Write a protein that binds this DNA or RNA. Structure first.
Ligand code: FES
Ligand SMILES: [K+]
Ligand SMILES: [K+]
Ligand SMILES: [Mg+2]
Ligand SMILES: [Mg+2]
Ligand SMILES: [Mg+2]
Ligand SMILES: [Mg+2]
Ligand SMILES: [Mg+2]
Ligand SMILES: [Zn+2]
Lengths: 190, 291, 232, 164, 50, 77, 115, 52, 109
RNA sequence: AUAGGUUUGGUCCUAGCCUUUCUAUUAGCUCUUAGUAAGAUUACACAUGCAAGCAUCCCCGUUCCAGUGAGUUCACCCUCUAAAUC
């Protein structure tokens, strides 16, 4: 149980944090246990599995007072390069994959909320010409059928065939006839 | 006629008023870094390099045009009532022919009612971003442009970052662009942070807004306090040109005011806080005499 | 804390050097073990000391008891300090290629935040010196004493920007991509400025290293390069 | 280290630093130069430094060399029409030779810019396909569109298993 | 490439057989009126023709 | 799919495809609609064909192409 | 490849994933596989509504006109799409299907009234 | 009439090229003669069943 | 569209004249080694129609593609002789020369 | 490769072998749910059922799609020019 869960950043300005870490990042003294001189290229999935911590928890998981929240800006700054603004990959600080994903999401949210500083470049305009006189962005002259309330083409509308042609079709397709259809409803029934 | 923002004379005044600080224009960027290179130079070569940097800064500080808000697009191409009720969602058709300006590009909508109409400005911008993606722009509006996040950005004095984001996201003549730029200018005016925009390409637009809205008192005060008297006088002249029928311009003509006299005439005629303008000018003159 | 390996003496800190008979204290200096060897019995130790502000040295101590060897090496090291010049107090002034006996060292100046991507002994020595951003490649025989000697020789024989400006009598102007075309004058001669420009060498006759060019062109295919590693 | 004097010549950066892109008429370059004699020094340097760049930018043009056949160095260009262009390079520097040949038979910057713009048209940003040819594989990579089911499962109502 | 002569031989003999076995209209367009099938091919005519 | 040399399935040797039933009014209206639609589409198609041919003409023997060629020749001379 | 006859046709090539279809409008030889070799990509079509409740169709109108003028045919779904865009007349079968749907809904309403 | 989008594009092209004509664009079909589907075709071009 | 022969204009050295009215010419091109990024000479033999039989072994000649091949391997015809073996005329000054020395001075004219 | 281990009474050099990293197949032991992607070792032999019709007769199609990797510079560019679409 943390008293800082509601308001995480206070923990970083509390004295206890100052004795524990001082001015150095919370991951400075971590060293990962592995075979060989070349580490594995991915960190462990999660240091907390079914509410049980591993023997060597990562910088975020060892200290339940450290809360990964987009408002905890001073903590998130410790996981971003101050010279390039790039989020460190997980092996760099040893954070587990789960906490690395959470930190990435928190950093992106803090940047989107304007709480975390990042380089915003100056870009050129999209359009060389800003005129809005073309017919694509203006009013096209209405067509006569549109103003008259008529369909664009006359054959869009149903026209009842003359009875002679219908009898001709009935002779041609005798024995394979469906019930004759009348004109459709004027508008779509609901 | 009344001068436009892009007039050569207005452009020259605003260019000189903006200034050119090479250190601020070419401040180090926080980005992926590479090892620097080194060159041995004489004094002449160093001066040539400095002039080339000044030219690059002039290109960088080119002002965005100030445009009027675009009129909404409400145009119907056809109404095929037969299609009414046969579809539940609208169709958006974008013409993606490469060699067409985006403002001449036909983008239409077939609604469930059967109406074939022209796409609105917001739909046009969204579709252009979808099919011709521009670096820095997002299809969905970023939340940074909400009131609270803009207030946070202003609290951090990141007005130039806000304007750069606005330029990247919105078109110059869109409602959102105008609203965000106006809010930034009002914040700068209310907390007197004009120096944030000096040596950038947004200073001219800020000055143009202040002049057309007749609130140049704060900027004039800042320029006097910063000993930029030429800038203050040019601001008064530009104000007179944009408002040639105002009592300030008539007073200047009557009194044959020139130089600081223009500022005094403006302070007595059309200044919301002319008393403080007079006080600051008097202090500046005393300091100049003492120095 | 452990060293380079669980059972290895290398990399382990020995604490500050003892107060010397001269009467000086060395509380700001840190000591690191670079090698411990059995001499056939006695013990020979190679240690390095450094204050993290450019002053650093190394020494060998021989004794029957290991702790006595540590003390001898540390005390002798503090009295044989090199001063290492650092560009902006984070890296070296230029690329340094050297050969000491059969060991080759290629060191590259790097921007801030790059880190120490170097042989582990080089990482230890650089941390003692105060270099924070550098690349280093060791080739030939990997002999620890030769590595230390060559490293210190090369780092002590680097020419600063001010030295180059005084030698050539010209402004040393730095160009950074993140700063655009702005020219940053990093050094100016104390004496007069030459008015004749440097010969614009159309093609310099420099000795290039095949590995660097191969890396530049994308023909390097090593599965071991650019591997994710812990912060150093 | 890299073998030979001036190894920088054998780097693609140097090879692409060339600025001579010949018009379609040029088919052959014959280069007559003298190994000894100060007046031909630039010509010799032209052979040493700039021929690799010229060939790199013009892979289909036949470049051939001739040594100590004439008292003076010169370049000869054979065009598709059968015309021959002779350029005396004696007393000239190699940079001057480059500038001269660029001026007389090299495509101007404007034509190269139109060629680059024509190239830009082939890779239409709207087209969807393999990353080798297109910016995006699928419309599901566009924000606001229905995402890939590999990453975000579709609602049960949109899946044939629970519609059948 | 080893020339393929059997292919040419097969093509020529097949062409010859075709030109010397051209069916006549009486065979091609005969019909069985009980089953409404072409005896030449065995294919049935469409229902709407029956 | 099957080839011409694959035997017919025994399950469908006695299968006769029966024609669908016809609604006379819809059938007649649909025939007229297809006639009008196809006339319109063929007109549009020949306009597109003529546009393509005209673009080829103006790309080969057009005035602008001729002037560009003359400019190139003049610069070469 | 060489085919015996055939022609170019502008059609819809299906990509995407299971339960998430997406179409590329391509001019291709009619004998080629559906999602195989094509001459040019003339646009795209997302049949699933997006977060704005829109179906997105991109049409390279210039190139579509070029290929129709070069003798390319059109598949029926492509013709219906072009009719919806207003580039062609509404296809006869869109109109007929609309009328059939109107009649079916009218029958359902009459059933409701009868009950 | 032209289809709605084609009509709009034609009018836009005219207006961009400076023309202010209000005459509706029209598609000519007197040259397209609707030939009935049951009109006799060319028996000379038709094929013949192959012997087998 | 003027010829079916790929190589239209090529300069080479005559290495054979043992045929009737046909010269065997050696053509060198520069090919970039993909690994070393150095240019090396690649040689190709061409047959050029010499109606007048004016070629001598060692002279530099220019060949123009025929409209169509006149034989299996004869696809080009001698447009001119760039450098006659041992009888070179300096193109720059127009004077006969022997190697790098003038046989007759330019000032003689 | 940022390298490491291993020859000797001992030091230095050279040199092989191996370790550390990332994939794929198979095997041992162990495995809960959901979405997606991919899926004989064998050009060895195959029971069985399907994979080509359409259409007022003529014609058209079954020469495509689908499969495999046995053989192996028939694939790309230019010239010329049939068949096919318009
Ligand atoms: S790749 Fe687009 S839906 Fe899967
Ligand atoms: K048929
Ligand atoms: K094979
Ligand atoms: Mg251990
Ligand atoms: Mg070894
Ligand atoms: Mg299959
Ligand atoms: Mg196939
Ligand atoms: Mg033909
Ligand atoms: Zn963890």
């Amino acid at each position: 149980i943390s008293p800082y869960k509601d308001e995480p950043w206070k923990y970083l300005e509390s004295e206890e944090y100052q004795e524990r870490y001082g001015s150095r990042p919370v991951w400075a003294d971590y060293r990962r246990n592995h075979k060989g001189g070349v580490p594995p290229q991915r960190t462990r999935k999660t240091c907390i599995r079914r509410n049980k911590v591993v023997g060597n928890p990562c910088p975020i998981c060892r200290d339940h007072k450290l809360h990964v929240d987009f408002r905890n800006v001073k903590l998130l700054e410790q996981f971003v390069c101050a010279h390039t603004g790039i989020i460190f990959y997980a092996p760099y600080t040893g954070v587990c994959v789960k906490q690395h994903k959470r930190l990435t999401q928190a950093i992106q949210k803090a940047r989107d909320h304007g709480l975390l500083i990042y380089h915003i470049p100056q870009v050129e305009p999209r359009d060389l010409d800003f005129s809005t006189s073309h017919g694509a962005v203006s009013a096209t002259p209405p067509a006569p059928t549109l103003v008259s309330g008529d369909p664009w083409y006359p054959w869009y509308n149903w026209k009842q065939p003359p009875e002679r042609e219908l009898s001709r079709l009935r002779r041609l397709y005798q024995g394979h006839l469906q019930e004759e259809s009348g004109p459709p409803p004027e508008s779509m029934p609901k | 006629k009344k001068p436009t923002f892009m007039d050569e004379e207005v452009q020259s005044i605003l260019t000189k008023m903006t200034g050119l600080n090479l250190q601020k224009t070419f401040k180090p960027a926080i980005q992926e870094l590479k090892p620097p290179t080194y060159k041995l130079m004489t004094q002449a070569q160093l001066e040539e390099a400095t002039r080339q940097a000044v030219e690059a800064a002039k290109v960088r500080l080119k002002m965005p045009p100030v445009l009027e808000e675009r009129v909404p697009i409400n145009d119907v191409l056809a109404e095929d009532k037969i299609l009414e009720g046969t579809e539940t969602t609208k169709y958006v058709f974008t013409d993606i022919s490469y060699s067409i300006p985006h403002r001449e590009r036909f983008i239409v909508v077939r609604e469930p009612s059967g109406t074939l109409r022209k796409a609105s400005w917001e739909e046009r911008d969204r579709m252009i971003q979808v099919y011709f993606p521009k670096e820095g722009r997002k299809i969905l509006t970023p939340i940074i442009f909400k009131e609270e996040n803009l207030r946070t950005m202003y609290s951090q004095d990141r007005h130039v970052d806000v304007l750069n984001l606005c330029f990247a996201q919105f078109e110059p003549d869109s409602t959102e662009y105008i609203k965000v730029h106006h809010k930034t200018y009002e914040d700068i005016d209310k907390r007197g942070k004009y120096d944030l925009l000096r040596s950038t390409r947004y200073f001219g637009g800020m000055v143009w807004y202040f002049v057309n809205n007749k609130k140049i008192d704060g900027l004039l005060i800042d320029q006097i306090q910063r000993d930029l008297i030429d800038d203050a006088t040019n601001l008064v002249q530009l104000y007179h040109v944009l408002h040639p029928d105002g009592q300030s311009a008539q007073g200047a003509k009557d009194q044959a005011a020139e130089g600081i006299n223009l500022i005094k005439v403006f302070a007595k005629t059309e200044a919301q806080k002319g008393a403080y303008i007079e006080l600051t000018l008097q202090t500046y003159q005393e300091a100049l005499s003492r120095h | 804390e452990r060293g380079w390996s669980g059972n290895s003496w290398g990399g382990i800190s020995l604490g500050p050097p003892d107060p010397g008979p001269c009467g000086e204290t060395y509380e700001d200096f840190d000591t690191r073990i670079l090698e411990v060897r059995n001499v056939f019995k006695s013990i020979r130790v190679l240690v390095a000391v450094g204050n993290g502000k450019g002053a650093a040295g190394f020494s060998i101590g021989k004794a029957t008891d290991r702790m006595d060897a540590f003390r001898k090496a540390k005390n002798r090291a503090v009295h044989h300090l090199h001063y290492i010049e650092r560009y902006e107090d984070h890296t070296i002034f230029h690329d340094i290629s050297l050969r000491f006996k059969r060991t080759h060292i290629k060191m590259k100046k790097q921007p801030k935040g790059y880190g120490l991507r170097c042989h582990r002994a080089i990482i230890t020595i650089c941390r003692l010196i105060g270099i924070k951003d550098m690349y280093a490649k060791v080739s030939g025989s990997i002999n620890m004493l030769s590595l230390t000697q060559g490293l210190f020789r090369g780092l002590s024989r680097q020419e600063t920007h001010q030295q180059l400006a005084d030698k050539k009598g010209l402004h040393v102007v730095e160009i950074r991509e993140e700063c655009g075309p702005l020219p940053i004058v990093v050094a100016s001669p104390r004496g007069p400025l030459r008015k004749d420009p440097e010969p614009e060498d159309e093609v310099p006759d420099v000795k290039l290293d095949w590995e660097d060019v191969k890396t530049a062109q994308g023909m390097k295919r090593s599965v071991w390069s650019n591997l994710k590693r812990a912060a150093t | 280290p890299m073998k030979g004097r001036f190894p920088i010549r054998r780097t693609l950066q140097y090879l692409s630093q060339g600025n001579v892109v010949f018009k379609d008429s040029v088919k052959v370059m014959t280069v007559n130069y003298n190994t000894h004699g100060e007046l031909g020094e630039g010509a010799r340097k032209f052979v040493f430094f700039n021929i690799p760049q010229i060939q790199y930018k013009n892979p289909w043009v036949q470049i051939m060399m001739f040594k100590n056949m004439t008292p003076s160095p010169f370049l000869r260009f054979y065009l598709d029409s059968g015309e021959q262009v002779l350029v005396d390079v004696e007393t000239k520097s190699n940079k001057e030779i480059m500038e001269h040949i660029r001026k007389i038979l090299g495509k101007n910057e404007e034509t190269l810019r139109e060629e680059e713009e024509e190239k830009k048209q082939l890779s239409h940003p709207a087209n969807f396909g393999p990353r080798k040819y297109c910016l995006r594989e699928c419309i599901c990579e566009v924000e606001g569109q229905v995402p890939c089911p590999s990453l975000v499962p579709l609602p049960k109502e949109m899946r044939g298993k629970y519609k059948a | 490439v080893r020339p393929r002569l059997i292919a040419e031989l097969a093509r020529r003999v097949r062409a010859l057989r075709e030109q010397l076995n051209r069916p006549r209209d009486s065979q091609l367009y005969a019909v069985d009126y009980e089953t409404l099938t072409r005896p030449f091919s065995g294919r049935r005519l469409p229902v709407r023709a029956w | 799919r099957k080839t011409r040399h694959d035997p017919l399935a025994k399950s469908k040797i006695e299968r006769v495809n029966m024609p669908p039933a016809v609604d006379p009014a819809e059938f007649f209206v649909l025939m007229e609609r297809y006639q009008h639609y196809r006339q319109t589409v063929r007109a549009l198609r020949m306009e597109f064909v003529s546009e393509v041919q005209r673009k080829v003409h103006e790309a080969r023997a057009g005035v602008l192409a001729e002037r560009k060629a003359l400019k190139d020749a003049a610069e070469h001379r | 490849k060489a085919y015996r006859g055939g022609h170019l046709t502008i059609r819809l090539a299906l990509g995407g994933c299971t339960n998430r279809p997406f179409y590329r409008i391509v001019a291709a030889h009619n004998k080629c596989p559906r999602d195989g070799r094509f001459v040019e990509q003339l646009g795209s079509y997302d049949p699933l509504p997006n977060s704005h409740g829109e179906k997105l169709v991109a049409l390279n109108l210039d190139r579509i006109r070029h290929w129709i003028g070069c003798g390319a045919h059109l598949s029926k779904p492509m013709e219906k799409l072009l009719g919806l865009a207003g580039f062609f007349p509404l296809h006869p079968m869109m109109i007929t299907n609309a009328e059939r749907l109107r009649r079916k809904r009218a029958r359902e309403v009459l059933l409701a009234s009868q009950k | 009439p032209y289809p709605p989008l084609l009509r709009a594009m034609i009018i836009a092209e005219r207006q961009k090229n400076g023309d202010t004509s209000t005459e509706e664009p029209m598609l000519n079909v007197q040259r397209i003669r609707m030939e009935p589907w049951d009109y006799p075709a060319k028996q000379e071009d038709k094929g013949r069943a192959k012997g087998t | 569209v003027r010829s079916s022969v790929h190589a239209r204009w090529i300069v080479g050295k005559v290495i054979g004249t043992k045929m009737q009215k046909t010269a065997k010419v050696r053509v060198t091109r520069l090919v970039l080694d993909p690994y070393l990024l150095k240019y090396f000479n690649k040689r190709k033999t061409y047959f050029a129609h010499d109606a007048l039989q004016q070629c001598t072994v060692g002279d530099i000649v220019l060949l123009r593609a025929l409209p169509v091949p006149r034989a299996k391997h004869v696809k080009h015809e001698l447009a001119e002789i760039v450098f006659k073996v041992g009888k070179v005329i300096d193109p720059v000054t127009g004077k006969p020369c022997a190697g790098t020395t003038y046989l007759e001075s330019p000032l003689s004219s």
